[PDB]
Assembly symmetry: C2
Homo-oligomer: 279 residues x 2
């Protein structure tokens, strides 16, 4: 019983006439080919919002293009089963009628972590997210916390443009024992599998430090690098700590931080991360 | 009886609550030091919308300061016309710190002006974009006088998908049709009787177009020829552009924007209009 809206005009009309009656709106922006990481988002919205809208749009500005998987049929059902009310599914031509006369580029945050690894990739994300927020007009918008760089960029845009939208970040779905779900987990030998549940722990035990005092980069970091090498053999490809939402590295921290792990196993290198604090 | 709101947070909250109850919102973005040009826009908004919000904000991003500031006087000026609220935010409220995202105007900022004052319109769209998200208007009013700005704003509303309808208000004219301007008092008795012909040549171009004409070059000559026979001064410009694209097209395909400039004894006057509808 979930509607599928294929035009911007219609979507605005619906939402416009819906707000003129105190009904709230939750919004989950996506590119389709939906999985459980998404439903976790739609569920949270449906429990704390009158109507939930899920958009499925493969955005050409963050990419040849028409090869990307498209199953609006299945996406709608997956989403319909969890309560979602509408699936906004506009055509490229409807969202980008012609050439853009105004351009949106993200500054600093676009270089942080891996900047030149895809310059202009985030320019394409904020451009659509910005349009989607003006089309759907949600009260809450839900973004995965896994791509913290994206969440910060998005939060930065809601602030700079003064969007009256509350940005809610949902935690990555994990495996029963704490392991981060990943397509590459399947290439783990039985021993490696359990020998990897330690990433899921060298993290939740690293927030214990922050939790009661510890606030020095080199100390909170090293405390981890030791924990890992202690419980595994595979080389620790990376263990970095950045401030958040600033995402920069600094000898000592002020606000929340972002930790990014990278253990290179046999035939597959896993990654994991989190951000802790509140300010 | 007009209320003065001094913070972003409070302005947003108020508008968000009013939108929920179905009241329509009219918005007039200004920089203060208001005159009748503005009140014309405010009056329009008041006759067609439930509430009308006027913002008075000196935007640091469109300055390359010591700009006039008379809020108490702008507050009263707009009250006499029935405005509901004057949104008057502090600079640090609008621009907390350093922008992490940047908005820029493309081609529309090169044509005519822009290339002469780079980034002027970048500051304009930036503040208008934030204002629309703060004030959440159904209708926003701008003067047609600055056609380049209007075109750019419309472009921005289209590209960002703002659910705002842009209303361009016509240039306020003297009883005889001359476009109201601060430069008008520098016209001698005689050249004042000639000046009225700039607006007259515009009614001409609109008449031609009105009658099927569609070749930029003919409307130019027809207008030019008219002005040269009625005004003794020298016509330093009679251009014709398409609108919104604002480019010198050889033959009309949609609507146009005409602009004149006549240099009088001690002042240069200008007039302009937009004919069409698509």
């Amino acid at each position: 019983m979930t509607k599928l809206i294929t035009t911007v005009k219609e979507m605005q009309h619906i939402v416009k006439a819906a707000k003129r009656s105190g009904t709230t709106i939750g919004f989950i922006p996506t590119m389709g080919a939906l999985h459980d990481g998404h439903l976790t988002m739609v569920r949270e919205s449906v429990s704390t919002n009158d109507i939930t809208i899920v958009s499925v749009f493969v955005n050409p500005l963050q990419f040849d293009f028409d090869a990307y998987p498209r199953q609006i049929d299945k996406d709608l059902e997956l989403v319909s089963e969890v309560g979602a009310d509408i699936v906004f599914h506009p055509a490229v031509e409807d969202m980008y009628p012609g050439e853009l006369g105004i351009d949106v580029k993200v500054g600093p945050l676009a270089d942080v972590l891996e900047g030149a690894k895809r310059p202009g990739h985030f320019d394409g994300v904020v451009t659509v997210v910005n349009k989607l927020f003006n089309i759907v007009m949600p009260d809450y918008a839900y973004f995965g916390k896994k791509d913290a760089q994206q969440l910060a960029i998005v939060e930065q845009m809601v602030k700079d443009f003064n969007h009256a939208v509350e940005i809610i970040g949902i935690d990555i779905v994990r495996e029963a024992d704490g392991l981060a779900k990943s397509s590459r987990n399947v290439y783990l030998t039985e021993q490696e599998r359990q020998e990897a549940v330690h990433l899921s722990k060298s993290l939740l035990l690293a927030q214990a430090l922050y939790q009661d005092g510890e606030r020095q980069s080199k100390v909170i970091i090293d405390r981890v690098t030791e924990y890992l090498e202690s419980h595994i053999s595979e080389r620790i490809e990376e263990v970095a700590v950045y401030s958040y939402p600033q995402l920069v590295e600094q000898h000592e921290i002020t606000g929340r931080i972002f930790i990014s792990l990278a253990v290179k196993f046999s035939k597959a290198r896993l990654i994991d991360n989190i951000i802790i604090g509140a300010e």
